[PDB]
Amino acid sequence: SRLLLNNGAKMPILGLGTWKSPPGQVTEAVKVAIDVGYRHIDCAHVYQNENEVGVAIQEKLREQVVKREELFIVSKLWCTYHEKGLVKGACQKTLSDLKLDYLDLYLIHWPTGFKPGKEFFPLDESGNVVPSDTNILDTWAAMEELVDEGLVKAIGISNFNHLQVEMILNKPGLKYKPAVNQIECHPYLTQEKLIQYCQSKGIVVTAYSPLGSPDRPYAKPEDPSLLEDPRIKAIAAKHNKTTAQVLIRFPMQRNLVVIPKSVTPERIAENFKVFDFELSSQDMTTLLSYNRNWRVAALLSCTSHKDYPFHEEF
Ligand SMILES: NC(=O)c1ccc[n+]([C@@H]2O[C@H](COP(=O)([O-])OP(=O)(O)OC[C@H]3O[C@@H](n4cnc5c(N)ncnc54)[C@H](OP(=O)(O)O)[C@@H]3O)[C@@H](O)[C@H]2O)c1
């Protein structure tokens, strides 16, 4: 239900994603989720809706539905704020849009540093993405003491390959360990080498894009669907659950936290009814056997960034 983090705080094994969640519909999404019984909201600045996602949390707090410490609000530092001077300001902007006084987990969104400016994705005239010469260990020391101003309860990372995680681990003075490396992970990109490396290290795995990110802007020629896989669909009807409900239960039982995005009030509901049933060893190893090494989000414009997390095997 809640996983213990290496900072002593417990983290709800189930939460709501807001990437691709419109400002108009992401206030009312969160409010309904919370009502339904969600206590974990996954936010990011680059997602552009945190204000509207923070109007949602202030109504439930006014309304006495939840106390602040019942919730577990998560956010991530975008690539253009990677310099020591920019980091506190970016947590502070997130902190005022959401309208909270502390975050519980603050994550480093990507390993890749970009040029600081108004553009989330800086480009040159050759069209390619412009990098900051800052590194991970520098950026980590700016986050390590957001903790010391008492702005965040915990700090983490998103999309680091095992080697990247290691850098922080053997950094002299490493005052604060990574509580959480959040990553993509579904039946087609099963991720068990990173998942079974982070876990030996006390780092918690959040699996994002758990349903296939069915609405991320890319669609290819003939992309694969999980929410519509025949094999995955049988496994569900056995459990009389839905293919969503099965694709959300899979991470959970890998001891992973799961953040399925929804702006639909009856889906937000469905996604919550995942607590009352087990998948079998057959199901979990079948589901597992389905991996195809395919990712939704591969950051294709930082392929050549010195800090591109995806050239390493895991
Ligand atoms: N850390 C990172 O760098 C990063 C990157 C990507 C994702 N993530 C996080 O992980 C969450 C992962 O979600 P994602 O955005 O990649 O998408 P997702 O969970 O794979 O799925 C979202 C999509 O699936 C639909 N959906 C929701 N419930 C469903 C249901 N029960 N039945 C059918 N379809 C369902 C949604 O529709 P409706 O909205 O129409 O209901 C939306 O189209 C994100 O929102 C975000 O918070 C983090």
Q: Which domains does the chain have, with CATH numbers?
A: 1-314 (3.20.20.100)
- Whether the CB of 134 sits within 6 Å of ligand 1: no
Taking CA atoms, 250 is separated from 224, 241, 255, 274, 287, in Å, by 18, 12, 9, 10, 8
- Whether the CB of 228 sits within 6 Å of ligand 1: no
**Positive/negative CA dihedral, 21, 22, 26, 29:** negative
For residue 253, the 8-state DSSP code is T
- CB-facing half-sphere around the CA of 2: CA atoms within 13 A: 15
Ligand 1 atom at minimum distance from 245 CA: 31
How far is residue 23's CA from residue 312's CA, in Å, rounded to a whole number? 36
Taking CA atoms, 197 is separated from 181, 186, 205, 235, in Å, by 11, 17, 10, 28
- Expressed in Å, this structure's resolution amounts to 2.9
50-62 helix and 23-36 helix, angle to the nearest 10 degrees = 40
The SS3 assignment for 91 reads helix
How far is residue 213's CA from residue 164's CA, in Å, rounded to a whole number? 25
Pocket mutation for ligand 1, best pick of 261, 271, 294, 299 (most atoms within 8 Å of C-beta): 261
Q: In this structure, are strands 40-42 and 152-158 parallel, antiparallel, or unpaired? A: unpaired
136-143 helix and 84-97 helix, angle to the nearest 10 degrees = 50
Scan for tokens 């056995």, then name that residue.
238
- 149 Cβ contact partners less than 8 Å away, ≥ 6 residues apart: 88
- Whether the CB of 94 sits within 6 Å of ligand 1: no
Phi/psi for 207 (5° steps) reads: -90, 110
How far is residue 191's CA from residue 85's CA, in Å, rounded to a whole number? 34
The SS3 assignment for 178 reads coil
Experimental approach: X-ray
Instruction: Give the distance (Å) from ligand 1 centre to CA of residue 149.
Output: 32
Instruction: Give the distance (Å) from ligand 1 centre to CA of residue 176.
Output: 30
Taking CA atoms, 59 is separated from 27, 192, 253, in Å, by 10, 39, 33
- Whether the CB of 17 sits within 6 Å of ligand 1: yes
Q: In this structure, what is the dihedral angle of CA atoms 34, 36, 42, 46, given to the nearest 10 degrees? A: -80
- Whether the CB of 108 sits within 6 Å of ligand 1: no
Q: Which amino acid is at 147?
A: V
- For residues 215 and 191, the answer to whether their CB atoms sit within 8 Å is no
- For residues 259 and 40, the answer to whether their CB atoms sit within 8 Å is yes
Scan for tokens 């001077």, then name that residue.
85
Q: Which residues on adjacent β-strands are paired with residue 186?
A: 189
47 is catalytic: yes
243-252 helix and 230-238 helix, angle to the nearest 10 degrees = 90
Q: How deeply is 141 buried, as exposed, middle or buried, from its count of CB atoms within 10 A (0-12, 13-18, 19+)?
A: middle
- Whether the CB of 245 sits within 6 Å of ligand 1: no
Instruction: Give the distance (Å) from ligand 1 centre to CA of residue 78.
Output: 19
Instruction: Give the distance (Å) from ligand 1 centre to CA of residue 17.
Output: 6
- Whether the CB of 111 sits within 6 Å of ligand 1: no
Q: Whose CA is nearest to atom 11 of ligand 1?
A: 17
How far is residue 29's CA from residue 42's CA, in Å, rounded to a whole number? 12
Q: Which entry of 38, 47, 197, 308 is annotated as an active-site residue?
A: 47
